Design a protein around this ligand. Structure first.
Ligand SMILES: *[C@@H]1O[C@H](CO)[C@@H](O[C@@H]2O[C@H](CO)[C@@H](O[C@@H]3O[C@H](CO)[C@@H](O)[C@H](O)[C@@H]3O)[C@H](O)[C@H]2NC(C)=O)[C@H](O)[C@H]1NC(C)=O
Ligand SMILES: *[C@@H]1O[C@H](CO)[C@@H](O[C@@H]2O[C@H](CO)[C@@H](O)[C@H](O)[C@H]2NC(C)=O)[C@H](O)[C@H]1NC(C)=O
Ligand SMILES: *[C@@H]1O[C@H](CO)[C@@H](O)[C@H](O)[C@H]1NC(C)=O
Ligand SMILES: *[C@@H]1O[C@H](CO)[C@@H](O)[C@H](O)[C@H]1NC(C)=O
Ligand SMILES: *[C@@H]1O[C@H](CO)[C@@H](O)[C@H](O)[C@H]1NC(C)=O
Ligand SMILES: *[C@@H]1O[C@H](CO)[C@@H](O)[C@H](O)[C@H]1NC(C)=O
Ligand SMILES: *[C@@H]1O[C@H](CO)[C@@H](O)[C@H](O)[C@H]1NC(C)=O
Ligand SMILES: *[C@@H]1O[C@H](CO)[C@@H](O)[C@H](O)[C@H]1NC(C)=O
Ligand SMILES: [Zn+2]
Lengths: 900, 109
């Protein structure tokens, strides 16, 4: 009822500019706490009279001056009423200043505040990061303000629409550097009170959102290179890392990608610099802070001699994603978090446009089908998903906000962006985005504003679409899910319906469009592209989809559109024979579509499961990477359902037969594993062949990965395992080995100097088959001295991936959830990801009981960021019980027969 | 002849590791800028080179505009100042697989 009890801010006060001064103490005080002292002065205009000031604040202690937590002053002759009392409302994280009188409309006011906070290792707000230089424990003060943690460093109106200018100041030790969004406004002047401390004031920022602020204080070095658009680029990181040259690669691509995005979207980069800094302790992968982008070390650094090609891809993709945010999210922000897909959906699509420019020989845009489209289809098929644009009233609390940073906003947004640019064409799509950026620069927008400017581009270019741009995209944005296109090639009929993994699931969400989509269908006939078609009705008919004799069709060419396709039994048979005759006749991207769609269709009871498994028969003579991966991905679901049952044995034998020819081929192609493929895709094919070969019991692989690891143990300094193979060779060699191999890989993980190497070691240690080792290793994941809090959740997710640890982690989660939730509430621990991963195997009514009881027990404690993930687990589990009962026998039959 | 080349990186914290060195100390043995370019008295003479080699940063003398290599006793006057009618073969400070900087020139004619 009260204003300060609601989670949304009042429109009465709107900020204009901020003055902030922070001072981190990188040493523990006598209480043992790393603290930071700060002072802030915010100038705001009163748009509506009110007798109370509501401003965000979180975990902040205020110095009392003039008997109150803040001091209110006037601007331009305005009379600030006396403050009656100030209070802190913890639930909604507010700082309520009750006044004796009301404020004048159209009058500016300034509010002073002196406060203190903790420089915790919770990777949120103004937090600390630590590393080791020689034998010294270096400490760093970094920042993570997304989504609503800027209130954790200084009081402000922490909302994306409350844009303003920030006059940042950083009081740090003399022997340390201070960085921020802008460049220093003159050199650092030693603080007069104490010459052991310097002061660095930074230039005023442009109109930006609070969640984009960043204040870093480190002793890092850097490497720089003036970009092609005059922007200064700097790659900050630990001294030893910079010296060894791990930042050189990011320096090579950052500049060019930045300038590429500038030209592609006809919009310059406003700021004079863009710093890329790599923290040792970061929660997410990276943050798009305007001017000072922050990265995980594994997302920015790269060692040409010990990093893998997939690590190099990670870096460029992450950099591109972050640099794209400079335009979509920073220059043009969202009105409210409910439209998060406008920032992360654009970046997740544009990340490929930039990466393809940096490394064009990689053809990375093709991987978007597997890494994005099908990554989100698995969750968007559930009735517990959410639309791309949830209503603003449905998102209010911080938990509900952090929850939206999921595959839907990232991947489905990217998939919708893919489908949009394919039927609009890139050159046209680029146009509308340029007008959309220029208009709403330094402002905030909603999904509607985008339709307006995209519709204009259709008018200038005279593009013909079945209807307005607003009405075609509203079908994919306002309502969740996606359709399944059922084709009757005998009669050329076309049908569509809401695809659900569990046909019995109860769709609760209402849709103004009643779950009917307007999909652009692209098809091919015997390997020849047909005329594009638009489906505006629930059921249609067209000659484009009719066949006769040997003629066969395939809809959704290169999977540009975000929808699954299913054909009649006859057409499937013609496709299967075509794959056995000459699979090269099918687009490599669509070969993956055939496998992925069929498997997900079987799960939906739309086609027999025996069909999907038949589509994986041609893989025995398949050399590409993408089709094999699509199968291994869909088959991972079979591993989850059957790796604790009689069905696994036969499954391993069938895979062991399908992959062995490829493994032998790469042994001859790689000169006995001495070299790697030149093409990046083939490099990944080699790895997927080695991992699948060893996981399924090919003894030649098992004898090789063990012999390599043993050679390494003999000469630890000289690692003979090529980076691309280290990931897979490590996991298998530790599972086959014993404690002597586990301790050696543990010794390596502690003494490691490269995070890419440590990450491979950390995961591989979770492959031990000994139950006592996994139990010991689990207790390590909660010791910040042994495993970084930023890697805790990940390491636990790796142990549960082990069939011997599946029950150990589930028991661990059930027993100490509250303790695990209270301690890591809103910190370095992601609860959604862990829930999603621990429940993946549930397939029995007993497990469903355990999960439903887990929900009932901890309903008082809550789940926050994992609420939706819990419901999705409950639905996916109920579906798994039916699926296994229905297919346990038929599947076992198919694996045993085709394994011979 | 015994050319000593050396250089130091931007000191302090927050240093730019690949920027142009902050200090340069190119010193030709038994050479006086004021007396003038010292010439090789005899074809029998030993020429050594002592460039800085720390980590990935190294200093070397690559002969560019002059068709003779420093270090070969076989087959002219050498100076650190511009001598007329002569070629300018520069002295560089290299960063492995990254940018490099010309810190000084060893002239010859
Ligand atoms: C913290 O502030 C102190 C004092 O401002 C900085 O120390 C001084 O930094 C300046 C700028 O780099 C240097 O000034 C020097 O002046 C001499 C003339 O005496 C001039 O020849 C140099 O070219 C240079 O401009 C000076 O080296 C340095 N003084 C010392 C020895 O401390 C300090 O750099 C600041 N620290 C940080 C991390 O900002
Ligand atoms: C579908 O995707 C395939 C693979 O990405 C595309 O095939 C490539 O086409 C380009 C020309 O655009 C050629 O230069 C490449 O050599 C092809 N790669 C192959 C076949 O290995 C194909 O163009 C895409 N088709 C459409 C129209 O989307
Ligand atoms: C911030 O600095 C700008 C430019 O110097 C100034 O106009 C503005 O009033 C300052 N704001 C505050 C709150 O100090
Ligand atoms: C702020 O005050 C609370 C007690 O009200 C205390 O527990 C907390 O440690 C204080 N913050 C800091 C940084 O000391
Ligand atoms: C799978 O193929 C086998 C023969 O290769 C056949 O016996 C079986 O009926 C097929 N299943 C379907 C439904 O395609
Ligand atoms: C320059 O190098 C020579 C090499 O011996 C050394 O003797 C001299 O002291 C150096 N001068 C500087 C700048 O220290
Ligand atoms: C170099 O030549 C000048 C000019 O005669 C004179 O200072 C002296 O001869 C030489 N100086 C040194 C340092 O030997
Ligand atoms: C960056 O580019 C430079 C020059 O093109 C190249 O020498 C260097 O190897 C590249 N850095 C890396 C490690 O990719
Ligand atoms: Zn992002």
């Amino acid at each position: 009822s009260k204003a300060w009890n609601r989670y949304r801010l009042p429109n009465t006060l709107k900020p204009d500019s901020y003055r902030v001064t922070l001072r981190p103490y990188l040493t523990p005080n006598d209480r043992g706490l790393y603290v930071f002292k700060g002072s802030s002065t915010v100038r705001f205009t009163c748009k509506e009279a009110t007798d109370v000031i509501i401003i965000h604040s979180k975990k902040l202690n205020y110095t009392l001056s003039q008997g109150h937590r803040v001091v209110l002053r006037g601007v331009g002759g305005s009379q600030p009423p006396d403050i009656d009392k100030t209070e802190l409302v913890e639930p909604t994280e507010y700082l309520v200043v009750h006044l004796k009188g009301s404020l004048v409309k159209d009058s500016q006011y300034e509010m002073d505040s002196e406060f203190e906070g903790e420089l915790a290792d919770d990777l949120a707000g103004f937090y600390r990061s630590e590393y080791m230089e020689g034998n010294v424990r270096k400490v760093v003060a970094t920042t993570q303000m997304q989504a609503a943690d800027a209130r954790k460093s200084f009081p402000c109106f922490d909302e994306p629409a409350m844009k303003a200018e920030f006059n940042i100041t950083l009081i740090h030790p003399k022997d340390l550097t201070a960085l921020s969004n802008m460049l220093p406004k003159g050199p650092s002047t030693p603080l007069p009170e104490d010459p052991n401390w310097n002061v660095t004031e930074f230039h005023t920022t442009p109109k930006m959102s609070t969640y984009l602020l960043a204040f870093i204080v480190s002793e890092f070095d850097y490497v720089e290179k003036q970009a092609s658009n005059g922007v200064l680029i700097r790659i900050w990181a630990r001294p030893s890392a910079i010296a060894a040259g791990h930042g050189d690669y990011a320096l090579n691509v950052t500049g060019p990608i930045l300038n590429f995005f500038a030209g592609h979207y006809d919009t310059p980069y406003p700021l004079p610099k863009s710093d890329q800094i790599g923290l040792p302790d970061f929660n997410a992968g990276a943050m798009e802070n305007w001017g000072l982008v922050t990265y995980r070390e594994n997302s920015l650094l790269f060692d040409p001699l010990s990093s893998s090609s997939s690590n190099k891809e990670r870096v460029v993709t992450v950099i591109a994603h972050e640099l794209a945010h400079q335009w979509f999210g920073n220059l043009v922000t969202i009105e409210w978090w409910n439209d998060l897909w406008l920032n992360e959906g654009f970046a997740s699509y544009v990340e490929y446009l930039g990466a393809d420019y940096a490394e064009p020989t990689w053809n990375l845009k093709d991987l978007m089908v597997l890494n994005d489209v099908y990554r989100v289809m698995a969750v968007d098929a559930l009735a517990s998903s959410h639309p791309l644009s949830t209503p603003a009233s449905e998102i209010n609390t911080p938990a509900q906000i952090s929850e939206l940073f999921d595959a839907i906003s990232y991947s489905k947004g990217a998939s919708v962006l893919r489908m949009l640019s394919s039927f609009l064409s890139e050159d046209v799509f680029k146009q509308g985005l340029a007008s959309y950026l220029h208009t709403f620069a330094y402002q905030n927008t909603i999904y509607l504003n985008l339709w307006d400017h995209l519709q204009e581009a259709v008018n200038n270019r005279s593009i013909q679409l079945p209807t307005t741009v607003r009405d075609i995209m509203n079908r994919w944005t306002l309502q969740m899910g996606f359709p399944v296109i059922t084709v009757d090639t005998s009669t050329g009929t076309l049908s569509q319906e809401h695809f659900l993994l569990d046909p019995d699931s109860n769709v609760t969400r209402p849709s103004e469009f009643n779950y009917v989509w307007i999909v652009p269908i692209t098809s091919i006939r015997d390997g020849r592209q047909q005329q594009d078609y638009w489906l505006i009705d629930v059921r249609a008919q067209n000659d484009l989809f009719s066949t006769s004799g040997n003629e066969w069709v395939l809809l959704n060419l290169n999977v540009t559109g975000y929808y699954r396709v299913n054909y009649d039994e006859e057409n499937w048979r013609k496709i299967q024979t075509q794959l056995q005759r000459d699979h090269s006749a099918i687009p490599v991207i669509n070969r993956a579509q055939i496998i992925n769609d069929a498997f997900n269709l079987a799960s939906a009871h739309k086609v027999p499961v025996t069909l999907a498994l038949n589509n994986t028969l041609f893989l025995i003579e398949e050399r590409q990477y993408m089709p094999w991966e699509a199968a291994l991905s869909s088959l991972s679901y079979f591993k989850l359902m059957f790796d604790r049952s009689e069905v696994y044995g036969p499954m391993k034998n069938y895979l062991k037969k399908q992959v062995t020819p490829l493994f032998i081929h790469f042994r001859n192609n790689t000169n006995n594993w001495r070299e790697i493929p030149e093409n990046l895709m083939d490099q990944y094919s080699e790895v997927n062949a080695i991992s699948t070969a060893c996981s399924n019991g090919v003894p030649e692989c098992e004898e090789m990965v063990s012999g390599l690891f043993k050679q390494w143990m003999e000469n630890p300094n000289n690692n003979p395992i090529h980076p691309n193979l280290r990931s897979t060779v490590y996991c298998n060699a530790i599972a086959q080995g014993g404690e002597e191999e586990w301790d050696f890989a543990w010794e390596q993980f502690r003494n490691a100097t490269l995070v890419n190497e440590a990450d491979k070691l950390r995961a591989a240690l979770a492959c031990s088959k000994e139950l006592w080792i996994l139990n010991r290793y689990l207790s390590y994941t909660l010791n910040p001295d042994l495993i970084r809090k930023q890697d805790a959740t990940s390491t636990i997710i790796s142990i549960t991936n082990n069939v011997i640890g599946q029950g150990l982690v589930w028991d661990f989660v059930q027993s100490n959830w509250k303790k695990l939730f209270n301690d890591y509430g809103g910190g370095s621990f992601s609860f959604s990801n862990l829930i999603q991963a621990v429940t993946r195997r549930f397939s029995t009514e007993y497990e469903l009981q355990q999960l439903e009881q887990f929900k009932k027990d901890n309903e008082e404690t809550g789940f926050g960021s994992g609420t939706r993930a819990l419901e999705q687990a409950l639905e996916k589990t109920k579906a798994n019980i039916k699926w296994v009962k229905e297919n346990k026998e038929v599947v076992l039959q198919w694996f045993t027969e085709n394994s011979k | 002849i015994v050319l000593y080349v050396d250089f130091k990186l931007q000191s302090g914290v927050g240093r730019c590791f690949n920027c142009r060195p902050a200090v340069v100390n190119i010193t030709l043995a038994n050479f006086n800028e004021t007396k003038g370019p010292l010439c090789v008295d005899t074809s029998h003479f030993t020429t050594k080179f002592v460039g800085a080699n720390f980590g990935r940063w190294s200093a070397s003398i690559n002969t560019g505009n002059c068709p003779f290599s420093f270090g070969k006793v076989n087959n002219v006057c050498f100076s650190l100042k511009d001598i007329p009618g002569g070629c300018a073969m520069p002295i560089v400070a290299n960063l492995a697989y990254l940018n490099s900087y010309t810190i000084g020139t060893l002239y010859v004619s």
